[PDB]
Design an enzyme around this catalytic site. Structure first.
Site, PDB file in Angstrom:
ATOM      1  N   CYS A   1       0.828  -1.216   0.000  1.00 23.36           N
ATOM      2  CA  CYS A   1       0.000   0.000   0.000  1.00 23.36           C
ATOM      3  C   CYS A   1       0.853   1.253   0.000  1.00 23.36           C
ATOM      4  O   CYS A   1       2.020   1.237   0.422  1.00 23.36           O
ATOM      5  CB  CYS A   1      -0.920   0.015   1.236  1.00 23.36           C
ATOM      6  SG  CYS A   1      -1.451  -1.602   1.839  1.00 23.36           S
TER       7      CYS A   1
ATOM      8  N   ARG B   1       2.406   0.524  -5.726  1.00 26.56           N
ATOM      9  CA  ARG B   1       2.372   0.025  -4.354  1.00 26.56           C
ATOM     10  C   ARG B   1       1.093  -0.669  -4.030  1.00 26.56           C
ATOM     11  O   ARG B   1       0.908  -1.024  -2.869  1.00 26.56           O
ATOM     12  CB  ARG B   1       2.566   1.151  -3.323  1.00 26.56           C
ATOM     13  CG  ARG B   1       3.972   1.584  -3.216  1.00 26.56           C
ATOM     14  CD  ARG B   1       4.257   2.682  -2.231  1.00 26.56           C
ATOM     15  NE  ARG B   1       5.654   2.468  -1.915  1.00 26.56           N
ATOM     16  CZ  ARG B   1       6.095   1.830  -0.843  1.00 26.56           C
ATOM     17  NH1 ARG B   1       5.265   1.408   0.150  1.00 26.56           N
ATOM     18  NH2 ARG B   1       7.395   1.678  -0.753  1.00 26.56           N
TER      19      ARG B   1
ATOM     20  N   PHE C   1      -3.036  -2.643  -1.592  1.00 22.11           N
ATOM     21  CA  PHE C   1      -2.608  -3.800  -2.372  1.00 22.11           C
ATOM     22  C   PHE C   1      -3.147  -5.050  -1.719  1.00 22.11           C
ATOM     23  O   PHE C   1      -2.597  -5.500  -0.769  1.00 22.11           O
ATOM     24  CB  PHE C   1      -1.083  -3.877  -2.443  1.00 22.11           C
ATOM     25  CG  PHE C   1      -0.586  -4.951  -3.358  1.00 22.11           C
ATOM     26  CD1 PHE C   1       0.365  -4.647  -4.376  1.00 22.11           C
ATOM     27  CD2 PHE C   1      -1.080  -6.260  -3.249  1.00 22.11           C
ATOM     28  CE1 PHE C   1       0.818  -5.632  -5.271  1.00 22.11           C
ATOM     29  CE2 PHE C   1      -0.661  -7.262  -4.152  1.00 22.11           C
ATOM     30  CZ  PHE C   1       0.296  -6.953  -5.152  1.00 22.11           C
TER      31      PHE C   1
ATOM     32  N   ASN D   1      -0.785   1.037   6.359  1.00 23.69           N
ATOM     33  CA  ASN D   1      -0.034   0.262   5.407  1.00 23.69           C
ATOM     34  C   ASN D   1       0.906  -0.677   6.164  1.00 23.69           C
ATOM     35  O   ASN D   1       1.851  -0.227   6.811  1.00 23.69           O
ATOM     36  CB  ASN D   1       0.709   1.177   4.428  1.00 23.69           C
ATOM     37  CG  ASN D   1       1.862   0.472   3.721  1.00 23.69           C
ATOM     38  OD1 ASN D   1       1.689  -0.545   3.013  1.00 23.69           O
ATOM     39  ND2 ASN D   1       3.043   0.993   3.919  1.00 23.69           N
ATOM     40  N   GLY D   2       0.645  -1.985   6.087  1.00 22.28           N
ATOM     41  CA  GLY D   2       1.453  -2.957   6.821  1.00 22.28           C
ATOM     42  C   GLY D   2       0.735  -4.256   7.175  1.00 22.28           C
ATOM     43  O   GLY D   2      -0.131  -4.689   6.423  1.00 22.28           O
TER      44      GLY D   2
ATOM     45  N   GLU E   1      22.773 -20.292  -2.912  1.00 26.73           N
ATOM     46  CA  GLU E   1      22.649 -19.223  -1.903  1.00 26.73           C
ATOM     47  C   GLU E   1      24.011 -18.731  -1.575  1.00 26.73           C
ATOM     48  O   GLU E   1      24.160 -17.902  -0.707  1.00 26.73           O
ATOM     49  CB  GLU E   1      22.184 -19.803  -0.600  1.00 26.73           C
ATOM     50  CG  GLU E   1      20.855 -19.319  -0.099  1.00 26.73           C
ATOM     51  CD  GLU E   1      20.870 -19.177   1.404  1.00 26.73           C
ATOM     52  OE1 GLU E   1      21.978 -19.297   1.900  1.00 26.73           O
ATOM     53  OE2 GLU E   1      19.842 -18.901   2.041  1.00 26.73           O
TER      54      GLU E   1
ATOM     55  N   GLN F   1      13.175 -21.700   3.518  1.00 25.53           N
ATOM     56  CA  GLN F   1      13.339 -23.130   3.332  1.00 25.53           C
ATOM     57  C   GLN F   1      12.639 -24.043   4.319  1.00 25.53           C
ATOM     58  O   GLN F   1      12.643 -23.832   5.542  1.00 25.53           O
ATOM     59  CB  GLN F   1      14.804 -23.507   3.169  1.00 25.53           C
ATOM     60  CG  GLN F   1      15.671 -23.435   4.409  1.00 25.53           C
ATOM     61  CD  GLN F   1      17.018 -24.030   4.100  1.00 25.53           C
ATOM     62  OE1 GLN F   1      17.968 -23.275   3.885  1.00 25.53           O
ATOM     63  NE2 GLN F   1      17.085 -25.376   3.946  1.00 25.53           N
TER      64      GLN F   1
ATOM     65  N   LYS G   1      13.424 -24.729   7.919  1.00 26.33           N
ATOM     66  CA  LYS G   1      13.638 -23.576   8.786  1.00 26.33           C
ATOM     67  C   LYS G   1      12.975 -22.254   8.357  1.00 26.33           C
ATOM     68  O   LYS G   1      13.589 -21.220   8.288  1.00 26.33           O
ATOM     69  CB  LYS G   1      15.118 -23.484   9.242  1.00 26.33           C
ATOM     70  CG  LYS G   1      16.130 -22.855   8.308  1.00 26.33           C
ATOM     71  CD  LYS G   1      17.488 -22.955   8.949  1.00 26.33           C
ATOM     72  CE  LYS G   1      18.617 -22.619   8.018  1.00 26.33           C
ATOM     73  NZ  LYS G   1      18.906 -23.701   7.049  1.00 26.33           N
TER      74      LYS G   1
ATOM     75  N   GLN H   1      22.234 -20.633   6.848  1.00 25.98           N
ATOM     76  CA  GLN H   1      23.186 -20.886   7.891  1.00 25.98           C
ATOM     77  C   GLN H   1      24.367 -21.662   7.348  1.00 25.98           C
ATOM     78  O   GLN H   1      24.161 -22.762   6.809  1.00 25.98           O
ATOM     79  CB  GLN H   1      22.512 -21.843   8.818  1.00 25.98           C
ATOM     80  CG  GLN H   1      22.922 -21.758  10.214  1.00 25.98           C
ATOM     81  CD  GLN H   1      22.036 -22.648  10.909  1.00 25.98           C
ATOM     82  OE1 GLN H   1      22.452 -23.679  11.406  1.00 25.98           O
ATOM     83  NE2 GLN H   1      20.753 -22.338  10.846  1.00 25.98           N
TER      84      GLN H   1
END
Ligand code: FMN
Ligand code: AKG
Ligand code: F3S
EC number: 1.4.7.1
Length: 1475
Positions: A1, A31, A207, A227-228, A871, A937, A940, A946
Site C-alpha cells: 500500500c 504500491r 494492495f 499500510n502494513g 545461496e 526453506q 527452517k 546458515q
C-alpha cells in the site's frame, strides 16, 4: 500500500491540497494491486475535512440554514443498489441517528461517474450518499463525533458489502472505492470540483491478496489508513475481546459502552480492527497520537535518544504492562480532524518520507518525490526512524516525535513515580512418564545445559507426523510453528535483539482506558522465582494438573474440573493460577496421570476468556513436561504468562551432578561448568530459543506472542481444538480428548508398573534399528546409490525399504481412483519429457562441496532440466560450456569432476536470490534461465541461511566476498521485502535486469500460503515454489527441523486452490518440493496442483550421500557436504548417476500414468478428484483424518487453460528501455565510449540504470567494459535507483531517491546531490532511503544527506560517503569501506564481520549506540587510515561539492579527533586500523 498525508497550516482550505493528494496517490500506484480485471483497484481513498464550501449548494438548493462548522457532521454512506433495499437501509441510518437525540437534514446524492470503474468494481459498486445531520440540544465538535461514533458503530452492527458507513463525523470525511489510484478522482466528482477544499488529506492506495474487491475495504478508514500487517492479530483481538464487557470511562455510560458491543472481531482485517481499536482510545479522550503509542509503542529499551526523556520511558514502562503491541510492520496515518499524523511500527518496517516548507506546509508519505513543492522553499526533508511520529495541530504547528511523546509523558504521570510505588533416581522415571526420552535429554537438554545454545543439526525431518506415527509423542508435537513470508518479515533475533524482550507481566490488567497509578524478566522462572512469586503480589491457587485413577475416570473430566476449578478460583480472588502437575510435592503411579501442560494452559486460558475473567489473573505453568525451546513457545503461545520447568531444570542437575559427567569435565567435555553455569546455560539457551521462534513471525515481544497462537495444529480433532486451542487451524483434524489421554498412558505406562534404568530411545533425530521410521537411512541409500552406479536388485532393496514404512505423510493416506481405462506404456509421454519437469533444487555451494554441486548441475543440464545455485554464489568458470573433455572423462577446467562429456555444462539454470545475497552479482543474475527469490526453506521457515565457519573455506569466502574464518548466519528477512509490494519491487528489479528470465518465489507450506501466493501472483512472479517442512538442510536448529513448517500436501493444495479461485492460476507455474524421492511422489504432487518437482536430499543420495547426517559438521565421509579437500577427494559420483536416477523416477511416473490412463502429466495436474482415502490404513492414535483439505479442489476435468503460462512477465515500457535506445548501443558494442545522457526521473521510475547494467553485463560480464556511460538524472528516484550498477557506469542524481539505491551495486559510481536551489543544509537533510547498497559487491556511492535504516546492509565490497543515517548502519557488512559524516541510529555494527567504516559523531554519544557484539570502536590512529578516510572524504567533495565535506577538509586537523572508526576483529591487523 501507499499512504501519506498533506497538511496545511498557514493557508485556509484551498483546492490545491486536494489536487496534490490525488496526484500523489497517483505515484503510489505500483504500491497497490488490481483485481482480476487488471483495472479495478484493490482500493484507493482519501480523508479530508468537511468540504463545507461544496456542501453549501445542498442546503442552499433546499433553502436551509447551514449549521456551524463543528455542528454539521456528515455521514458518507455506502448503500444497497436495489431501491427497496436502499430505503430499508436508509431508514435504519436515520432510525439510529435519530436514536441519539440528533436530527437528519436529509441526504446528498454523491455525483459519481460509474463509467470509469473497471468491470468488477462497477458490478460491486454501492449506491453512495451522504446523510447530513445536526443536534438540536446544541452538541458540537467532540460530543457530536463522540455521538456519531456511537452511531456509525450501531449501524456497524449490520455491516455489509452493500451497507457500510465510510465516515460519520462533524470534522472529517472519507471518499474511497475500489478504484485504481488516479481513477479515484475520475469516479468521485466532488474531488475534481474546485469547491472541494481541506486543510489536509490523508490518502491511501491498497494492495490486496485477492481479486474480488469489496468496497468497504478500501482504505483510509474512519481514523487511519494503515499500510502494513499485524502479525499478532489473533492475540491482540483476544485481549481486546476480553476487555469488552468491563469497560469504564468518565460519564461514558454502561449502555453507550455496551453499544460498541464488539469493537474487534477476527473476521475483519487487521486494518478495520486497528482503526476500530484506535478509535476507542480516541473517542475516550486520548489524541490519536497517544492512542497509537499505547497500541504500537516504540522499542524504548536501550534507547540513547531517550536520555533526556525519561518521562516517555515511563509511560511505556507503564503501558507495557497493560497493552501488548499490535505488531508487524505499519506506517500508520490518521486524522482526528483536530490532528493529522503518522508513525511507524517499533521496527520501521515501512518507508515514511516527510517534507516541510517555510510556511510549515507538510507532506508525509511512503515515497519521497511525491507532492511537488517549489524546491527553493524546502525547510526540512526527513523521515521516520523506527517508532517515530510526526504531526500537525490546528493551532498551526507541526509536531516532531519528541514534543509529542513527551506531551503524554507530561500528563497522568505517576510514570516513574507510581511505577516505583507498585535424591533417589526416580528422576529417571518422572522423566519417563512426563514423556522425556533418551534423545530429549542427551540430544536437547544436555547440549543446551552444556554449550548454552539449543543444538544445531542437519537434513530434513525424515520422520512421520506426530499423529500418524506409531511412537509416543508430546501434544506439543502436533503444533507446527508459523512464520513470516512475503506479506511481512521475520526479524533478526541476534543482530536486532535490542528491539525484543521476554518480559511478562504477572499482575492483572485493569482498565486500558483509565490511567491510574492504581514483572518477570523472562518467562522461565527458576525454583527461587517460583517461591518468590508465590510470596509476591497475590496468593496463588495450585490447581492439580494431577488426577487420580478410576472414580474421576477420564482425561476429559479432569479437564472439565480443572477449568471449573480454575473458573471458581479466579472468581474467589485468585490473581495467579500456578497449574502444577507437581501439587503438594509429588507424582505417584496412582496420581494415575496428568493433564498435559499445553492442554491445561489452553483450557484455562480459553475457558477463562469464555467466562469474562481472562483479564483477572495471569498464568504460571509449573510443569516437568517442558524442556524444548518449542515447548516453551507452545505454552506462552496458548496462554502461559510464564513457566517453571522444574523437571527440565532437574535434569540439568542430575546430568551435571552425576559421576560420568563430572568425570569427563575433569578431561574431555568442558569443566567450565560449575552448576551455576550449567543451569544459567540451560535457561539462557531457552531464552535465545524463544527470541528465535518469535523472530520467525517478526514478533519483538513475548508480550505480543503471548496472546497470539502462532501455530498450525496438524492432527488435532475439531472438538479437541475448540476446547483447548480455539481458532487455530487444524485441517486434517485427528485426535480427541480420550485420544490424547491414551498417549499420555503410553509413556506413563513405562515408569511405574514396570521398572526404570535408562529412558527409551526411539530414533527421532537419527535412524535406529529399534526406533521411529525415516524416509532416508544409510542402508537404504547405500543401495539406491549402487543401483544408479550400474545403469538393480538394489531397487528390490531400496524399493523394499520403501514398502516397510508406516504412514509418514498425508499423501500416504491417499490412493488412486482412476476414471478411465488403463493404458499402454508406449502411449505415455517419453521419459525425456517428464525429466524436464525435474529440479535438483537449490543447495548452496557453501553447504555442498563443489564436486557434488557441479555434478548435480551437469546432470541436470544433461536431461534438459534445471539445477539450482543455492545461496552461496556460483564460480564464474561454470558459466561456460566445456571444450576440453578427454577420453578418460576429465577436464582441465574442472579437474575435480568425473565422467564428463564434451557438451556438459556445470552452470546452474536457476540462480538463487537469498537474504545474504552472497554471490549476487550482475553476471551471476545474467547467467540464469530463471531467478529464485528464497523467501524460505522447509527445514527452517522464519530463519536465514546458515553456514558454519568450519565450512567457510577461502574458495567460499571468495565466492561470497566475505571473510575466510567466519560463520555466515544470513538475515531472517530480505532487507528488501517487508511487504508484498516490496516483493513486487524485487521481482521487478530482477525482470528489469534480465527481461528474459522467469522469476520464482520460494515459500514454505503453512496455513496462509494461499493468500500469500495470490499476492506473489499479483506481484508479477513467474513461478512459486511450495516447500514442505520435510526438506533438507546442510544445517538448521533441530527445533526447526522438527517444529517449523507444514506438509506440502497442505501448501500445494492451498496455493493451487486459492490461485484458481482468485483466477490467478494461469499466472504462475507451481514447484512443489520436500521429501519427494519416488514417481508416486511426483504423481501425488501433480494431482495436488504442482507442475514441476523438486529434489534435494535424494539427489545428494544418488551422488553418494550415505545418511551420515553430519552435514553441518564438515565431515561428510563421502565428499558431498564438506569443504575438506581430503573428504572431497573421496567423492565418488558422476553426472551419469543422477541422470539415471531421474530416469528411474520418470519411468516410474510413466507407468502410474498408465494405471491411471493418461498420456501426459499435462493431463493430471490438480485432477484431485482422481484421489480417494485409503482402505487399509489404521493409525495408532485416532480413528481417521479429515481429508477435505486435500480432496476438495476446483474441478479440473475441462477447465485446464490455467496450465498455459506466458513465457515471462514483463516490467512494461520502462525508462531504461529508451536509455538503451539512442547512440547508446554504440558505446556498448564499441567497447569503449563516452556517452552522456540527461533525464527527468519521476518516482515511478524504478530500478533505473539496472537494465543497462544487465545489458553491458550480458556481454562483458562484470568487469570487461571500459566505456563510460554517464547517465544524469533529475527528480525523485523511484525504488532501487542504480541497482546492480557496473564498471564504466556513472549515475548522477540531481534531486533525491528512495529505498534501495545502489541495491546489488557491483562497479562504478552513483553521485546523488540535492537540487542546488535548496536553501537547506544538505547534511542535516535526508536524501536516500532504507537498505541502500544491499549486498554490494563493488562500486562507490556518494550522497549528500542522511540515509535510511540498514545502510549498506550486506555490504561486501562497495564503498560510499553519505552524510548521516538511521539505525543498523552497516548491518551484516563484510568488506568495503563506508563513511558517514553525520549522526546515525543505534545498532551501528550488528554482525559486521569485515570491512572498514568511519563515522564522525560530534554529539560524542556514538559508543552508546554501536552494536558491541563484534565490532570495536577506535579513534583514527593508523596514519594509513587517515589516508583512507581523506581519499574518500575528498572523493565525495570532488563528485558533490559537499558542505559538511568541504568543512572537514580545510579543518582536517580538528574534526579528525573525537570521531570513531569501526573495526571488526578481522581487520585488527591491517595497514589502516594499526600503525
Ligand atoms: C545440503 C542442503 C543444502 C541446502 N541449501 C539450500 C539453500 O541454499 N537454499 C534453499 O532455499 N534451500 C536449500 N536447501 C533446500 C533445497 O533447496 C530444497 O528445498 C530441499 O532440499 C528439498 O527437500 P528434500 O531434501 O526433501 O528433497 C538445502 C538442502 C540441503 C539438503
Ligand atoms: O550455504 C548457506 O549459506 C546456508 C544454506 C543452508 O541454510 C542449508 O544448508 O540448509
Ligand atoms: S547426511 Fe550429510 S553429512 Fe554426508 S552422508 Fe549425507 S551429506
Amino acid at each position: 500500500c501507499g499512504v501519506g498525508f498533506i497538511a496545511n497550516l498557514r493557508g485556509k482550505p484551498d483546492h490545491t491540497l486536494v489536487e496534490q493528494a490525488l496526484k500523489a496517490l497517483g505515484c503510489m500506484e505500483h504500491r497497490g494491486g488490481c483485481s482480476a480485471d487488471n483495472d479495478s483497484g484493490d482500493g484507493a481513498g482519501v480523508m479530508t475535512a468537511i468540504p463545507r464550501e461544496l456542501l453549501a449548494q445542498w442546503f442552499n438548493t433546499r433553502n436551509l440554514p447551514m449549521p456551524d462548522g463543528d455542528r454539521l457532521g456528515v455521514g458518507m454512506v455506502f448503500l444497497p443498489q436495489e431501491p427497496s433495499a436502499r430505503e430499508v437501509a436508509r431508514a435504519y441510518v436515520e432510525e439510529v441517528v435519530r436514536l441519539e437525540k440528533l436530527t437528519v437534514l436529509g441526504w446528498r446524492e454523491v455525483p459519481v461517474n460509474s463509467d470509469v470503474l473497471g468491470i468488477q468494481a462497477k458490478n460491486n459498486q454501492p449506491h453512495i450518499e451522504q446523510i447530513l445531520v445536526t443536534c438540536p440540544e446544541g452538541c458540537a465538535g467532540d460530543e457530536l463525533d463522540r455521538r456519531l461514533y456511537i452511531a456509525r458503530s450501531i449501524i456497524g452492527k449490520k455491516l455489509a458489502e452493500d451497507f457500510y458507513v465510510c465516515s460519520f463525523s462533524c470534522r472529517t470525511i472519507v471518499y474511497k472505492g475500489m478504484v485504481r489510484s488516479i481513477i479515484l478522482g475520475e469516479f468521485y466528482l466532488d474531488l475534481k470540483n474546485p469547491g472541494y477544499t481541506s486543510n489536509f488529506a490523508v490518502y491511501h492506495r491498497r494492495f490486496s491478496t485477492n481479486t474480488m474487491p469489496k468496497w468497504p475495504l478500501a482504505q483510509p478508514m474512519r481514523l487511519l489508513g494503515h499500510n502494513g500487517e499485524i502479525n499478532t492479530l489473533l492475540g491482540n483481538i483476544n485481549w481486546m475481546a476480553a476487555r469488552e464487557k468491563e469497560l469504564e470511562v468518565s460519564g461514558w455510560t454502561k449502555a453507550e459502552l455496551e453499544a460498541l458491543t464488539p469493537i474487534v472481531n477476527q473476521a475483519n482485517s487487521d486494518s478495520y480492527n486497528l482503526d476500530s481499536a484506535l478509535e476507542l482510545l480516541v473517542r475516550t479522550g486520548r489524541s490519536p497520537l497517544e492512542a497509537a503509542m499505547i497500541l504500537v509503542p516504540e522499542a524504548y529499551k536501550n534507547q540513547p535518544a531517550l536520555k533526556d526523556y525519561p518521562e516517555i520511558s515511563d509511560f511505556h514502562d507503564y503501558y507495557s504492562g497493560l497493552q501488548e503491541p499490535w505488531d508487524g510492520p505499519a506506517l500508520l496515518v490518521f486524522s482526528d480532524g483536530k490532528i493529522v499524523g503518522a508513525g511507524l511500527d517499533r521496527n520501521g518496517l515501512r518507508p515514511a518520507r516527510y517534507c516541510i516548507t517555510k510556511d510549515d506546509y507538510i507532506v508525509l508519505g511512503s515515497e519521497a518525490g511525491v507532492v511537488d513543492l517549489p524546491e527553493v522553499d524546502i525547510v526540512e526533508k526527513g523521515r521516520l526512524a523506527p517508532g517515530q511520529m510526526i504531526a500537525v495541530d490546528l493551532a498551526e504547528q507541526k509536531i516532531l516525535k519528541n514534543y509529542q511523546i513527551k506531551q503524554q509523558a507530561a500528563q497522568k504521570y505517576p510514570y516513574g513515580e507510581w511505577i516505583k510505588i507498585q535424591d533417589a533416581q526416580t528422576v529417571l522415571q518422572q522423566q519417563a512418564a512426563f514423556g522425556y526420552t533418551a534423545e530429549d535429554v542427551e540430544m536437547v537438554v544436555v547440549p543446551m545445559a552444556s554449550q548454552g545454545k539449543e543444538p544445531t543439526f542437519c537434513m530434513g525431518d525424515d520422520t512421520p507426523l506426530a499423529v500418524l506415527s506409531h511412537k509416543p509423542r508430546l501434544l506439543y508435537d502436533y503444533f507446527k510453528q508459523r512464520f513470516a513470508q512475503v506479506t511481512n518479515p521475520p526479524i533478526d533475533p541476534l543482530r536486532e535483539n535490542l528491539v525484543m524482550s521476554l518480559a511478562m507481566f504477572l499482575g492483572k490488567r485493569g482498565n486500558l482506558l483509565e490511567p491510574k497509578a492504581e514483572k518477570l524478566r523472562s518467562p522461565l522462572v527458576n525454583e527461587v522465582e517460583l517461591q518468590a512469586i508465590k510470596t509476591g503480589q497475590l496468593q496463588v491457587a495450585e490447581v492439580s494438573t494431577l488426577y487420580d485413577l478410576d472414580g474421576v475416570n477420564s482425561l476429559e473430566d479432569a479437564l472439565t474440573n480443572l477449568v471449573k476449578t480454575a473458573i471458581a478460583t479466579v472468581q474467589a480472588g485468585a490473581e495467579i493460577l500456578v497449574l502444577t502437575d507437581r501439587p503438594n510435592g509429588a507424582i505417584l503411579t496412582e496420581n494415575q496421570s496428568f493433564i498435559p501442560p499445553l492442554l491445561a494452559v489452553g483450557a484455562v486460558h480459553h475457558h477463562l476468556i469464555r467466562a469474562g475473567l481472562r483479564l483477572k489473573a495471569s498464568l504460571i505453568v509449573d510443569t516437568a513436561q517442558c524442556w524444548s525451546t518449542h515447548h516453551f513457545a507452545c505454552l506462552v503461545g496458548y496462554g502461559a504468562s510464564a513457566i517453571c520447568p522444574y523437571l527440565a531444570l532437574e535434569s540439568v542437575r542430575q546430568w551435571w551432578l552425576d559421576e560420568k559427567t563430572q568425570k569427563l569435565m575433569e578431561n574431555g567435555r568442558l569443566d567450565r561448568i560449575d552448576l551455576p553455569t550449567a543451569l544459567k546455560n540451560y535457561r539462557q539457551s531457552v531464552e535465545a530459543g524463544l527470541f528465535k521462534i518469535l523472530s520467525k513471525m517478526g514478533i519483538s515481544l513475548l508480550a505480543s506472542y503471548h496472546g497470539a497462537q502462532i501455530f498450525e495444529a496438524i492432527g488435532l480433532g475439531a472438538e479437541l481444538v475448540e476446547y483447548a486451542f480455539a481458532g487455530t487451524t487444524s485441517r486434517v483434524g485427528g485426535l480427541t480428548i480420550a485420544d490424547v489421554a491414551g498417549e499420555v498412558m503410553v509413556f506413563h505406562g513405562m515408569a511405574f508398573p514396570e521398572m526404570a534404568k535408562k529412558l527409551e530411545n526411539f530414533g527421532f533425530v537419527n535412524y535406529r534399528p529399534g526406533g521411529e521410521y525415516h524416509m532416508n537411512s544409510p542402508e537404504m541409500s547405500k543401495s539406491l546409490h549402487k543401483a544408479v552406479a550400474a545403469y538393480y536388485d538394489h531397487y528390490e532393496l531400496y524399493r523394499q525399504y520403501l514398502k516397510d514404512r508406516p504412514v509418514t505423510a498425508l499423501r500416504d493416506l491417499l490412493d488412486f481412483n482412476a476414471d478411465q481405462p488403463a493404458i499402454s506404456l508406449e502411449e505415455v509421454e517419453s521419459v525425456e519429457s517428464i525429466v524436464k519437469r525435474f529440479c535438483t533444487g537449490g543447495m548452496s555451494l557453501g553447504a555442498l562441496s563443489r564436486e557434488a554441486h557441479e555434478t548435480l548441475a551437469i546432470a541436470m543440464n544433461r536431461l534438459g532440466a534445471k539445477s539450482n545455485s543455492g545461496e552461496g554464489g556460483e564460480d564464474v568458470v561454470r558459466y561456460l560450456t566445456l571444450d576440453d573433455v578427454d577420453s578418460e572423462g576429465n577436464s582441465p577446467t574442472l579437474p575435480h569432476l568425473h565422467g564428463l562429456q564434451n557438451g556438459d555444462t556445470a552452470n546452474s539454470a536457476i540462480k538463487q536470490i537469498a537474504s545474504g545475497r552472497f554471490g549476487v552479482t550482475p553476471e551471476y543474475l545474467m547467467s540464469g534461465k530463471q531467478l529464485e527469490i528464497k523467501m524460505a526453506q522447509g527445514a527452517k521457515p522464519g530463519e536465514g541461511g546458515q553456514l558454519p565457519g568450519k565450512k567457510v573455506s577461502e574458495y567460499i569466502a571468495m565466492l561470497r566476498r566475505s571473510k575466510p574464518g567466519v560463520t555466515l548466519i544470513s538475515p531472517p528477512p530480505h532487507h528488501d521485502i517487508y511487504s508484498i509490494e516490496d516483493l513486487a519491487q524485487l521481482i521487478y528489479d530482477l525482470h528489469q535486469i534480465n527481461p528474459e528470465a522467469q522469476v520464482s518465489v520460494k515459500l514454505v507450506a503453512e496455513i496462509g500460503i494461499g493468500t500469500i501466493a495470490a499476492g506473489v501472483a499479483k506481484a508479477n512472479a513467474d513461478i512459486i515454489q511450495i516447500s514442505g517442512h520435510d526438506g533438507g538442510t546442510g544445517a538448521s536448529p533441530l527445533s526447526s527441523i522438527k517444529h517449523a513448517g507444514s506438509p506440502w500436501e497442505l501448501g500445494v493444495t492451498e496455493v493451487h486452490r486459492v490461485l484458481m479461485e482468485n483466477q490467478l492460476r494461469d499466472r504462475v507455474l507451481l514447484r512443489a518440493d520436500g521429501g519427494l524421492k519416488t514417481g508416486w511422489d511426483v504423481v501425488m504432487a501433480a494431482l495436488m496442483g504442482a507442475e514441476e518437482y523438486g529434489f534435494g536430499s535424494i539427489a545428494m543420495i544418488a551422488e553418494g550421500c550415505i545418511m551420515a547426517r553430519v552435514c553441518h559438521t564438515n565431515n561428510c565421509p563421502v565428499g558431498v557436504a564438506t569443504q575438506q579437500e581430503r573428504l572431497r577427494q573421496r567423492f565418488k559420483g558422476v553426472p551419469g548417476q543422477v541422470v539415471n536416477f531421474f530416469y528411474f523416477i520418470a519411468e516410474e511416473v510413466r507407468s502410474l500414468l498408465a494405471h491411471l490412463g493418461y498420456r501426459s502429466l499435462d493431463d493430471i495436474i490438480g485432477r484431485t478428484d482422481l484421489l480417494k482415502v485409503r482402505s487399509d490404513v489404521q493409525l495408532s492414535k485416532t480413528q481417521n483424518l479429515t481429508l477435505d483439505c486435500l480432496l476438495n479442489l476446483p474441478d479440473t476435468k475441462q477447465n485446464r487453460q490455467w496450465l498455459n503460462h506466458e513465457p515471462v512477465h514483463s516490467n512494461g515500457p520502462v525508462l531504461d528501455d529508451d536509455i538503451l535506445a539512442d547512440p547508446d548501443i554504440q558505446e556498448a558494442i564499441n567497447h569503449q565510449t563516452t556517452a552522456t545522457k540527461t533525464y527527468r526521473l519521476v518516482n515511478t521510475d524504478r530500478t533505473v540504470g539496472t537494465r543497462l547494467s544487465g545489458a553491458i553485463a550480458k556481454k562483458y560480464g562484470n568487469n570487461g567494459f571500459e566505456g563510460n556511460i554517464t547517465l544524469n538524472f533529475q527528480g525523485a528516484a523511484g525504488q532501487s535507483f542504480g541497482a546492480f550498477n557496473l564498471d564504466g557506469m556513472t549515475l548522477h542524481l540531481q534531486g533525491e531517491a528512495n529505498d534501495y539505491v545502489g541495491k546489488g551495486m557491483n562497479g562504478g559510481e552513483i553521485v546523488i546531490v540535492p537540487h542546488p536551489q535548496a536553501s537547506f543544509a544538505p547534511e542535516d537533510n535526508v536524501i536516500i532511503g532504507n537498505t541502500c547498497l544491499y549486498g554490494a559487491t563493488g562500486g562507490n556511492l556518494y550522497a549528500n544527506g542522511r540515509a535510511g535504516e540498514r545502510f549498506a546492509v550486506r555490504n561486501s565490497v562497495g564503498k560510499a560517503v553519505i552524510e548521516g543515517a538511521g539505525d543498523h548502519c552497516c548491518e551484516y557488512m563484510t568488506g568495503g569501506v563506508i563513511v558517514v559524516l553525520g549522526p546515525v541510529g543505534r545498532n551501528v555494527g550488528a554482525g559486521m564481520t569485515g570491512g572498514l567504516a568511519y563515522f564522525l559523531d560530534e554529539v560524542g554519544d556514538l559508543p552508546e549506540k554501536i552494536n558491541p557484539e563484534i565490532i570495536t570502536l577506535q579513534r583514527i590512529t593508523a596514519s594509513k587510515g587517515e589516508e583512507q578516510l581523506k581519499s574518500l572524504i575528498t572523493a565525495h567533495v570532488e563528485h558533490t561539492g559537499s558542505p559538511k565535506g568541504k568543512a572537514i577538509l580545510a579543518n582536517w586537523s580538528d574534526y579528525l579527533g573525537k570521531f570513531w572508526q569501526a573495526v571488526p576483529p578481522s581487520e585488527k591487523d591491517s595497514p589502516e586500523a594499526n600503525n
